[PDB]
Amino acid sequence: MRVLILGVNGFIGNHLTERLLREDHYEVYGLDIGSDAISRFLNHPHFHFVEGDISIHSEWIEYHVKKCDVVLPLVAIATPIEYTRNPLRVFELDFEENLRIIRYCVKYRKRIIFPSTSEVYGMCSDKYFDEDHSNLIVGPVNKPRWIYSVSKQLLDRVIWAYGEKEGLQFTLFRPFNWMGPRLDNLNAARIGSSRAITQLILNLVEGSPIKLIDGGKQKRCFTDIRDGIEALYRIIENAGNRCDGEIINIGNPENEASIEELGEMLLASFEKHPLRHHFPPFAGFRVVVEHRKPSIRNAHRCLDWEPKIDMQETIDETLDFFLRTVDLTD
Amino acid sequence: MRVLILGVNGFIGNHLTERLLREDHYEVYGLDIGSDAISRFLNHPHFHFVEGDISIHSEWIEYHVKKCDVVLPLVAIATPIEYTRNPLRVFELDFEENLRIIRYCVKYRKRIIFPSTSEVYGMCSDKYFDEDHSNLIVGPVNKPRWIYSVSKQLLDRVIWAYGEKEGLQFTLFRPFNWMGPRLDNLNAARIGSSRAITQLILNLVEGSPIKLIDGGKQKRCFTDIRDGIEALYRIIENAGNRCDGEIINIGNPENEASIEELGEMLLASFEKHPLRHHFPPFAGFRVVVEHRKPSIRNAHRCLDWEPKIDMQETIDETLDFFLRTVDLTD
């Protein structure tokens, strides 16, 4: 099984590649423009680094789709300010360039495992966002923050249509704030790591304040990467072909917190940490979609999966690794 | 003022071209693959027929964008069954090919007047759909009927972004069931004529039944083309530049009826018509988004416009012209 990861040089690429290389029947083709995040797999016999950029290359990516069996496109900009500061580039990369890769899979009859986004639900009023039943709610066109949500949704619909009409084999997945070791940088155009926890950990690391937009009462769910990657690994395995044509939220709905509470949890774990003294004093909380909890019935059904790691162990492990790998001279 | 109408060979093309040629300072370039719907303007000195197809041509359309001042792209498939039977083609034509035309306008700094759709609001619960304030509500990805609505919405957002970031001059308009003489054929890929009234008039003309999907209690608003085209003409005139960056619903919110009532109104006007005897007996009502009423404050503000024709005169005029131009030997 040849697995093509586009945008391997990051969080998901790292953790997914580790997982697949444990198993004896995977060849991982990791496409990216750099390899610093995964440099320890470069010498692995079943890892294959592929030089590339999905905006520049046509034929090279197309080739690698043909060569491989399953494809995971992880290249996208999901930086909120960018939705308003550089909307065209968000659209071009996240929509147009990924659409080309989708069409390569259709053409060579390959399976695609596509990262949809939890942002597709928008201001959905269900308490549990359900992939198969929840209505998707966005604001008017004069609220440009929604361009990312709606681009990703239209891409889902296009995948769905290729599936219905052209026999594309797909699974869509929606990560909810995955977190752990080897988080993407905040401005890396790679899907997967919780931007909210990376930002907060960054605040503590830099000694900048934690912004609570309107008191930080908006609630989010957070998912350990060990749980998340286990689910994604099962989607790849696709026991019984039970993931075919499915849309699967992957998150831990019991790991719910407002940004305020997430703030306090991180701070507690931080102040307790043996390396805390390398970092500045706490600059403080700064007052400047109200809920986003996944239904995980689809993951229960298709993957026989449920999350095993509590909030506190994921927080602690995520923070610990981040602090330990910070370069203190830079 | 050189006005480029892409998809001129239809309802809007006809009525818009008539209106602009009344005025002495318009040159109309009407692009299409046929001219039967507008053949009486072919000899007009200020009308210019342009052979073309927005899926086939690149450079020829690009040229005509450069040559002209304002552009109205009216080519799109808005046939509901097609959203589910041929979703990819709906996406390719309505989204991808229109996006090319948008980018030509951006590049040559031309004004674009773009037909958004009333379908963008989806299952919005406001009683009056408001371009600037109403949330847009669609179903899950497993409800593929929404691919049209969401493609059109993303196109609006992309136009909006070009406007914000690249100085594109645009106005977006949303027609609500425009109707009158020279209705598009039901399967013509040209925006503008109410598919609901064309279908019903067709039922009466053919002697097929009128389908009331779940009793036909869903309510719609209907707009005489004389009112609609007057508004569109004012958007073209753009007095005070008051339409710049605006989104404008064009409909008559007082012309509200369920499909059932629209049915009965048409039937009454039909049975009363002097040419009714050329058509079969009434095959009957057949039981097989609940409201879609526009806010028109933007049209009031920008265009100083309000609709002048009552339901009954538009119904009567629309039916009368349709019946009179039917070819009874075919």
Swiss-Prot record, chains A, B:
Active site: 119, 292
The organism's place on the tree of life at top rank: Bacteria
Binding residues for UDP-alpha-D-glucuronate: 78, 83, 117-118, 145, 177, 211-220
List of residues binding NAD(+): 32, 53-54
Region spans: Dehydrogenase ArnADH: 2-330
Induction: Induced by BasR.
Family: In the N-terminal section; belongs to the Fmt family. UDP-L-Ara4N formyltransferase subfamily. In the C-terminal section; belongs to the NAD(P)-dependent epimerase/dehydratase family. UDP-glucuronic acid decarboxylase subfamily.
Function, as annotated: Bifunctional enzyme that catalyzes the oxidative decarboxylation of UDP-glucuronic acid (UDP-GlcUA) to UDP-4-keto-arabinose (UDP-Ara4O) and the addition of a formyl group to UDP-4-amino-4-deoxy-L-arabinose (UDP-L-Ara4N) to form UDP-L-4-formamido-arabinose (UDP-L-Ara4FN). The modified arabinose is attached to lipid A and is required for resistance to polymyxin and cationic antimicrobial peptides.
Assembly, per entry: Homohexamer, formed by a dimer of trimers.
Protein name from the UniProt record: Bifunctional polymyxin resistance protein ArnA
Upper classification of the organism: Bacteria, Pseudomonadati, Pseudomonadota, Gammaproteobacteria, Enterobacterales
Residues of the full protein shown: 317 to 657 of 660
